[PDB]
Amino acid sequence: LSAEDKAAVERSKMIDRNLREDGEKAAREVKLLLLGAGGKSTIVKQMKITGIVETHFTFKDLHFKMFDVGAQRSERKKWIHCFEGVTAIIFCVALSDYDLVNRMHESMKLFDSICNNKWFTDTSIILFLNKKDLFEEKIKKSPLTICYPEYAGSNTYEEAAAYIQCQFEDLNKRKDTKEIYTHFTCSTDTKNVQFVFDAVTDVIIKNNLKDCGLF
Amino acid sequence: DEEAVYFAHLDIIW
Amino acid sequence: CQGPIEIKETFKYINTVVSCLVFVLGIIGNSTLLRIIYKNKCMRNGPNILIASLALGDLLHIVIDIPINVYKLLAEDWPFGAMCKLVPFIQKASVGITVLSLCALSIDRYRAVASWSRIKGIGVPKWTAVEIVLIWVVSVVLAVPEAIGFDIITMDYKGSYLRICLLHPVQKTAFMQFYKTAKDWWLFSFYFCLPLAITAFFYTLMTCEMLRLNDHLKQRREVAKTVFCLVLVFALCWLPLHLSRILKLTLYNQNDPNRCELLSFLLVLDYIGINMASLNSCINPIALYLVSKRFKNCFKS
Amino acid sequence: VQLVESGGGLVQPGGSRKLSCSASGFAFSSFGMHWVRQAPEKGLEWVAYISSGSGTIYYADTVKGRFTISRDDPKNTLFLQMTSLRSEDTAMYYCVRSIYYYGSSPFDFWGQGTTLTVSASADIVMTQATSSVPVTPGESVSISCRSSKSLLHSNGNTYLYWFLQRPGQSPQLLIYRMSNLASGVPDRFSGSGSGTAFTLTISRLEAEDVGVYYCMQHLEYPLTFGAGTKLEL
Amino acid sequence: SELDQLRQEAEQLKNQIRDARKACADATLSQITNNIDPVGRIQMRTRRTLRGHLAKIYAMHWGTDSRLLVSASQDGKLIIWDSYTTNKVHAIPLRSSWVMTCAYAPSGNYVACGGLDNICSIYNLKTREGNVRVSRELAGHTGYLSCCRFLDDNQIVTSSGDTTCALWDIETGQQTTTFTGHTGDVMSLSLAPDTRLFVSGACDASAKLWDVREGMCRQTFTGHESDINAICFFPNGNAFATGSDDATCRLFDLRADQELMTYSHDNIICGITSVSFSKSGRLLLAGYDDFNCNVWDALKADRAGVLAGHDNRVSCLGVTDDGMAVATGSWDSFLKIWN
Amino acid sequence: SIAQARKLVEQLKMEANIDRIKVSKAAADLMAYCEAHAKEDPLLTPVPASENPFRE
């Protein structure tokens, strides 16, 4: 029996329906996390849109939700578990940091930190190499061997980019589960967002096949 | 004629 | 006939051993597959529960079909009971939900690639919940012709008392008489022709969509290869059983004096046909072992 | 927070009329609505109720099926259509917003209301002790009410509400659930009772405390009313 | 004598505290409470279950009435749960999806909610409009806010990722008093029943007492060896218990200024999330990461009971003021009531 | 540099200057508080279903 509880549970169903609609809407949108050192402002301004910064935009009828957490400047361990269910991580590094001070060594330490993280063991990582124009001009003058004592090859962007690609992903002590999607940052638009769009759908397709038992 | 039931004697159940 | 039907002993001992091997493989494979799904709440989404019912179906068709098939081969009689009206039914109903849920798996798999979007879901989709009940109700209601279509009739075979259970040569129901005449056609156009018409077709649409970049094409190629083998194994496994029921209605006559000699090939073809058919229920746990590296930890644990 | 009602006036008997109430300053979608009527010579009377989500709709026994009630959240308007009303339906109509949860304040706000004139069991009755009582400023006055059925629910909450209706003004909520006071109500008002007989006490009555006291019920859903007690200065 | 003298003044006068604590430790807690009869096996059942949330639940808080509780999750929704009848009192859509803490005011009119953002917003539950809207924004922090607990209708105290703590006034929305002692990242905060002192813990394996009135660490405790994120006061206010990431719960008193008990088990190697005492303080409940919540005795330190009703991790649990029931929340978006 | 170290030394000296109470007295006080309120703790002492608001 109930007198006013009938309206109370009726409110609960109305409330529960709203979260179910909100939860379904949130599920339709996809979430991405931004990690980097210093280098990322240009990335978020190509993907057209104190604490953390959250950006929302739609591309090809897909709701893209991005998280900028590099401004936290606090202990990463105690809040990295909040992004456990993220679809992909956008790791942006600056190639020109090899000539500045050691900086790329910190990026590898950061990359190794979240590649081997327990909460990120099932999340793909998207690698972005910024300062493409800056690298092209300054790679002929300075040697890449400054931060790469073992490296020995031609002083050329094609060899320079390949060794960076060789070194970064090598840091992925889980070549099966993770999937590194490397790319070169371009000043012109309509291409960087295309790579991000194509990246996520690969993760969802693999995730869908994993649920279906194919992967 | 009726000997076909012998096949069903040793046939599987299906 | 001068060749009275009698299964050779050399083809009987070998059939007992191979049936036992599939029996022990199915018990271990199905129990492990059901246990991990129930134990872990994470593996309880849309496509996971579809496999669980099929795995539960693979748990069947091996505790009701093969235990009495080998027993009948060695005993060469039916003294177990009068019951025999169900072994056929739940056993064919078990064939209904293993054949049809394979098509249902293709339905969910198609939406996994065609919709790299509508696919998002907080929990178990409502369509899957409707499907999982509908998929069961279809086979049980489609196996009712085999429910009351079996009885016990005792013939005389050179001074011997033997009880043989089969379909009634004459049926009171007009529909049942048509079912007896169309036994092989219904048993083949639905359990074989239909899955080869949707599961193969929908998996074919995957290649035109999923396929039509170093780690993209190479990884996607194996998915198509590992999904076409699933329908190839299914076709090959159930072929000997379905094939040796069409020969009974195509070239089996009542006048030529070689029925025994011809039926000996047919009889042994049904014996290893059920062994291959039972292996089909044993293939998904094997398929989930060679692929889907997520299950590596589940199987190890 | 305003409730502006319109659509009343003089209507020939047996006709059709729609009353529109516009709600502002509060979440109309999340608030259930109640339409009530007050006779010129008698007390108030419940007419209809619609839920916040338009899920549960209830009507009084005297106007069951006859009336229609609807809400438009995007337009934020409550529409009450009445057809084939007789000579007993002439009254002043009020709209009350109510929200139902633990610690809530249902019937907190009361609409201005519109007059409507026409040309010429299984319910619990509140047996009010008296219809009028003289009062003086600076003195404490206690009024009493009775119910045919005990309102002590199984959850320990007694469902009785007290309403103050100033002359020429919309009624206001004084005490809800017989144990707590609404927002803006002076602390002098208090309620007590054992679930069958109830008493409302006012200490140091002021000039603004004059009016009519009305008791409601919520244990069941007839939504009956008391006779009302008139206070004379 | 330059910077060298400060270290000498730091190395020394630190031995004085440990020498004083060692000399003061006449007898351990386990050596006196031996005459206390054992509590025995404690069995609890899931009386009520809540499934409104759709994301991992981070923190929870019990109301004064012991009926309404606030549940927070990363989906960006605040739920006021009617634990008696299981329905949802309110649903507050939060501007910032990430949330790590939530508080219920003792009066019940206001609630607190904040996460990775440096602002833990305050929402009014008794508005005239009938909806729940933000009232003040405490955006003076720098790091991520980890726990802000309500002190009164006009005062709140917050703990952030930086080594700072702040006490705010609701009317002005400004840092009335600030604390800067911790050297790590403050995680959990607790308030004494007398509403004049509060203790908080950080990643530097230290818990520090602070006074809301004055504004300075009165005492510190360094009995742990790993990051601590669970700390709650005793019902009497003269002691408190601290949970760390090394599966160790330590009880610290406010009189001897030293650790007085270390609850630990060999079979437990996972971390602890939240710790809450009972009404009488005899029973201590700790939330562990191994998909399980454990019950310990404050005196005998025995495994009184185990609550393994959550599939994922128990990030938070709470005990009502009267101790009638215990509400716990985990990452499965589910809440369970044990009593 | 200097402020970060001098303030720490001053705070440490102020903390050390506070009084101390024997552990036996604190343990006895905690035991007395636990025993006095033991009858009022529903967790330690089970509550009957009639008096339990959370009983199903």
Do the chains contact at E54 and C122, CB–CB below 8 Å? yes
Residue A40: strand, helix, or coil: coil
Do the chains contact at D100 and A3, CB–CB below 8 Å? no
Residue A80: strand, helix, or coil: helix
CA distances in angstroms from E35 to A38, E32, E251, F31, listed in the order given: 61, 7, 20, 11
Residue E195 per-residue DSSP state:
S
Do the chains contact at A4 and D55, CB–CB below 8 Å? no
In A, minimum Cα distance to E96 occurs at A54
Residue C211 per-residue DSSP state:
I
Do the chains contact at A69 and E75, CB–CB below 8 Å? no
* Nearest partner of D73 among D105, D108, D26, D37, judged by Cα: D26
Is the CB of residue C105 less than 8 Å from the CB of residue C117?
A: no
Token pair, residue C64, equals: 């009701």
Residue C243: strand, helix, or coil: helix
Distance separating alpha carbons of residues E231 and E286, to the nearest angstrom: 10
CA distances in angstroms from A209 to A186, C101, E147, E250, listed in the order given: 32, 17, 40, 47
Is the CB of residue D88 less than 8 Å from the CB of residue D187?
A: no
Do the chains contact at E128 and D1, CB–CB below 8 Å? yes
Which uninterrupted H or E stretch holds D110? Answer: strand D109-110
Is the CB of residue D77 less than 8 Å from the CB of residue D22?
A: yes
Q: Interface partners of E (3+ CB pairs, < 8 Å)?
A: A, C, D, F
Distance separating alpha carbons of residues D95 and D48, to the nearest angstrom: 10
Cα dihedral value E50, E55, E59, E64, nearest 10: -30
Resolution to 1 decimal place, in Å: 3.0
Burial class (CB in 10 A: 0-12, 13-18, 19+), C301: exposed
Distance separating alpha carbons of residues E126 and C57, to the nearest angstrom: 56
Residue whose pair of structure tokens reads 């409104």 in the numeric block: E52
CB atoms near residue A6 (< 10 Å): 14
Would strands A30-36 and A62-68 be described as parallel, antiparallel, or unpaired? parallel
* Nearest partner of D228 among D220, D216, D61, judged by Cα: D216
Distance separating alpha carbons of residues C73 and C68, to the nearest angstrom: 8
Out of F8, F15, F41, whose CB is closest to E278? F41
CA distances in angstroms from C283 to C72, C238, C294, E245, E318, listed in the order given: 25, 12, 18, 45, 49
Q: Which CATH class is domain C10-145+183-300?
A: mainly alpha
User: Buried b / exposed e across A174-187, counting CB within 10 Å, b at 16+?
Assistant: eeebbbbbbbbbee
Positive or negative CA dihedral for A72, A75, A76, A81? Answer: negative
Sheet (strand E207-211) strand order? E188-191, E197-201, E207-211, E220-221
Is the CB of residue D7 less than 8 Å from the CB of residue D19?
A: yes
* Nearest partner of D42 among D194, D165, D222, judged by Cα: D165
CA angle E242, E197, E60 (to 5 degrees): 55
Out of B5, B6, B13, whose CB is closest to C91? B13
Token pair, residue E148, equals: 């802000």
Is the CB of residue B10 less than 8 Å from the CB of residue C15?
A: no
Distance separating alpha carbons of residues C219 and C228, to the nearest angstrom: 15
Distance separating alpha carbons of residues E207 and D229, to the nearest angstrom: 63
Assess whether chains B and F touch, using the rule of 3 or more C-beta pairs within 8 angstroms: no
Do the chains contact at E144 and A50, CB–CB below 8 Å? no
Which uninterrupted H or E stretch holds D202? Answer: strand D197-202
Residue whose pair of structure tokens reads 């008794």 in the numeric block: E126
Token pair, residue C209, equals: 């969509």
CB atoms near residue C234 (< 10 Å): 21
User: Buried b / exposed e across C203-225, counting CB within 10 Å, b at 16+?
Assistant: beebeeebeeeeeeeeebeebbe
Alpha helices in chain A (DSSP H): 5-28, 41-46, 103-115, 132-138, 157-170, 192-212
Residue A19 contacts D where some CB pair is shorter than 8 Å:
no
Residues in chain A: 215
Do the chains contact at E299 and F9, CB–CB below 8 Å? no
Interface size E-F, in CB pairs within 8 Å, comes to: 153
Beta bridge partners of D32: D98
Question: What DSSP string describes E66-123?
Answer: SSEEEEEETTSEEEEEETTT--EEEEEE-SSS---EEEE-SSSSEEEEE-SSS-EEEE
Give the CA count within 13 Å in the CB-facing half-sphere of E101.
Answer: 32
Chain A contact probe: residue of D57, D101, D159 with most A CBs at under 10 A:
D101
Do the chains contact at E17 and F16, CB–CB below 8 Å? yes
Is the CB of residue A78 less than 8 Å from the CB of residue E229?
A: yes
Distance separating alpha carbons of residues D122 and D222, to the nearest angstrom: 8
PDB experimental method: cryo-EM
In E, minimum Cα distance to F5 occurs at E6
User: Buried b / exposed e across C60-81, counting CB within 10 Å, b at 16+?
Assistant: bbbebbbebbbebbeeeebeee
Q: What is the CATH number of the domain that holds F20?
A: 4.10.260.10
Give the CA count within 13 Å in the CB-facing half-sphere of C34.
Answer: 14
* Nearest partner of C255 among A129, B3, D162, D91, judged by Cα: B3
Beta bridge partners of C153: C164
Distance separating alpha carbons of residues E39 and A205, to the nearest angstrom: 54
For D31: left if phi > 0, alpha if psi spans -120 to 50, otherwise beta; the answer is beta
Residue type, C40: N
Would strands E188-191 and D141-146 be described as parallel, antiparallel, or unpaired? unpaired
Interface size A-E, in CB pairs within 8 Å, comes to: 80
CA angle A18, A21, A22 (to 5 degrees): 80
Is the CB of residue D80 less than 8 Å from the CB of residue D36?
A: no
Burial class (CB in 10 A: 0-12, 13-18, 19+), C51: buried
Q: Interface partners of D (3+ CB pairs, < 8 Å)?
A: A, E
Is the CB of residue A64 less than 8 Å from the CB of residue A57?
A: yes
Beta bridge partners of E148: E158
Positive or negative CA dihedral for D90, D91, D97, D102? Answer: negative
Is the CB of residue E337 less than 8 Å from the CB of residue E46?
A: yes
Would strands A180-184 and A124-130 be described as parallel, antiparallel, or unpaired? parallel
φ, ψ for residue F55, nearest 5 deg: -65, 140
Token pair, residue F4, equals: 């970060």
Which domains occur in chain E, in start order?
2-338 (2.130.10.10)
Residue F26 sits in which domain range?
2-54
Diameter over CA atoms, chain A: 85
Residue D13: strand, helix, or coil: coil
Residue E181 contacts F where some CB pair is shorter than 8 Å:
yes
E-strand ranges in E101-222 read 101-104, 110-114, 120-124, 133-136, 145-150, 155-160, 165-169, 174-179, 188-191, 197-201, 207-211, 220-221
Do the chains contact at A213 and C47, CB–CB below 8 Å? yes
CA angle A49, A53, A58 (to 5 degrees): 30
E-strand ranges in E222-271 read 228-233, 239-244, 248-253, 259-264
Distance separating alpha carbons of residues E89 and E99, to the nearest angstrom: 19
Beta-carbon contacts of C260 under 8 Å, excluding residues fewer than 6 positions away, are: C1, C2, C3, C4, C5
**Three-state DSSP string of E35-56:** HCCCCCCCCCCEEEEECCCCCC
Residue A181: strand, helix, or coil: strand
Q: Which CATH superfamily is domain A30-206 in?
A: P-loop containing nucleotide triphosphate hydrolases (3.40.50.300)
CA distances in angstroms from A206 to A200, A210, E70, listed in the order given: 10, 6, 37
Give the CA count within 13 Å in the CB-facing half-sphere of F39.
Answer: 1
Distance separating alpha carbons of residues E318 and F2, to the nearest angstrom: 43
CA angle E36, E37, E40 (to 5 degrees): 130
